Design goal:
heterodimer, A: 443 residues, mainly alpha, Rhopdopsin 7-helix transmembrane proteins, Lysozyme, three-stranded antiparallel β-sheet, 20 helices, 70% helix, 6% strand, B: 8 residues, little secondary structure, 0% strand, palmitate (chain A), receptor (chain A), glycoprotein (chain A), transducer (chain A)
């Protein structure tokens, strides 16, 4: 009746406008702003190019042939569209695992992944993803032809169908695709996003807190007191000796860097300084009693103070140290907000105090909460992508094993909506990008 | 009687 074609036109016209406005927008904002072109966004640019390739070059040749019940277009485009329809899904699935491998190496093992987060590596894997996708999907332009059929009163009409030599070669192809495009990309992404969620659940630690409160400066730089410090708050010497700062530095490390310590050299010295700060608390008869009775969040704050001030300096906070042992947290915060350490470094002192008062990492839960926001978005686009393309790949396997029953039950309206679900996947990714930053303000 | 469907 008239209702099925009418809803097919307004649905396809809307998803065409949505996928052509967003994907054109995201390729612009990335090609305009070099600040946005991170390693993760480079893959998302490739993912957005394939979604536009599938919407512009393929989505029309799927609706208007169905609405006409005839493939009026030539036989060379039946081979071209099916070629691009297959290449688009292959690069999109395998770019979605590239970001999962990228986020795994950047979070779970940030030490041995330096060969991955380089921009030249991402360019050669999106080149390999696009190149091999065109090579893997070569059977589609080869075994796609026009199948003649009669409609009404000897009305000759053609249809574009994918036909292989035998049924064995047909069911071994759709099994190969379900295996290489959904099953294998599925388990490697659950172990990737699962291991990532394990690290992000570990929360903020003391080494990340001190790395935030101090930062990394490779050259010898003046601290708040004026003395030369290097690395992550490693004091060289309090005596005004510019030569002793170079000698004491080269005495610890294994060469005369003349103030040019590598990034891995500063981490070895930063790990040693924390051990010297926690063992200074254990030997102190005033800091050890309060350290053993504090929470893991509050214990890290006490070591943060020893890292900055020293064992003898913080041990003089006898009024605040007893207040911490008295578990009266809000009162210890007011007593600590009146010291010299709070006025010498107000920003650093406010963070360490709020961890004492609340016992939470909320003062440093910023970059961790931003990393949690990106992973939650990447998990949604993967679930939405699989939810859209599973009905068509599973129905193609049913058609390869039982062609009579599969075509009989779903060939009119059911397959018309199954394909419509697979085409919505091209526009849902730009919609999620918007809904992340203040798009929820609109109404 | 369109029966079946275009590949993808």
């Amino acid at each position: 009746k008239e209702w099925q074609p009418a809803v097919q036109i307004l649905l396809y016209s809307l998803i065409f406008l949505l996928s052509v406005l967003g994907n054109t927008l995201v390729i612009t904002v990335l090609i305009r702003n070099k600040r946005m072109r991170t390693v993760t966004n480079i893959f998302l640019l490739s993912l957005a190019v394939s979604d536009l390739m599938l919407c512009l070059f393929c989505m029309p040749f799927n609706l208007i042939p169905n609405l006409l019940k005839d493939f009026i277009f030539g036989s060379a485009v039946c081979k071209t569209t099916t070629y691009f329809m297959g290449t688009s899904v292959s690069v999109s699935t395998w770019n979605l695992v590239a970001i999962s491998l990228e986020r795994y190496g950047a979070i779970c093992k940030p030490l041995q992944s330096r060969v991955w987060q380089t921009k030249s590596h991402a360019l050669k894997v999106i080149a390999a993803t696009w190149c091999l996708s065109f090579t893997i999907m070569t059977p589609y332009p080869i075994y796609s032809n026009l199948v003649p059929f009669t409609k009404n009163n000897n009305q000759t009409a053609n249809m574009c169908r994918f036909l292989l030599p035998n049924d064995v070669m047909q069911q071994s192809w759709h099994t190969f695709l379900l295996l290489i495009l959904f099953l294998i990309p599925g388990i490697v992404m659950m172990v990737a996003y699962g291991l990532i969620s394990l690290e992000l659940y570990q929360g903020i630690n003391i080494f990340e807190m001190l790395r935030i409160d101090e930062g990394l400066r490779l050259k010898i730089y003046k601290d708040t007191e004026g003395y030369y410090t290097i690395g992550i708050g490693h004091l060289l010497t309090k005596s005004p000796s510019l030569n002793a700062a170079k000698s004491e530095l080269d005495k610890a490390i294994g060469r005369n860097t003349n103030g040019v310590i590598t990034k891995d050299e500063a981490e070895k010295l930063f790990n040693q300084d924390v051990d010297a700060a926690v063992r200074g608390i254990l030997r102190n008869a005033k800091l050890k009693p309060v350290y053993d009775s504090l929470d893991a969040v509050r214990r890290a704050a006490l070591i943060n103070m020893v890292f900055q001030m020293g064992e003898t300096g913080v041990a003089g906070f006898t009024n605040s140290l007893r207040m911490l042992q008295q578990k009266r947290w809000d009162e210890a915060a007011v007593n600590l907000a009146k010291s010299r350490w709070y006025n010498q470094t107000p920003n650093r002192a406010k963070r360490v105090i709020t961890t004492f008062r609340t016992g939470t990492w909320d003062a440093y839960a910023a970059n961790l909460m931003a990393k949690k926001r990106v992973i939650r978005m990447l998990i949604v686009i993967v679930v939405l992508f699989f939810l859209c393309w599973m009905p068509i790949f599973s129905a193609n396997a049913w058609r390869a094993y039982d062609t009579a029953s599969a075509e009989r039950r779903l060939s009119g309206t059911p397959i018309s909506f199954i394909l419509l679900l697979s085409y919505t996947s091209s526009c849902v990714n730009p919609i999620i990008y918007c809904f992340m930053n203040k798009r929820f303000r609109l109404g | 009687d369109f029966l079946g469907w275009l590949x993808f």
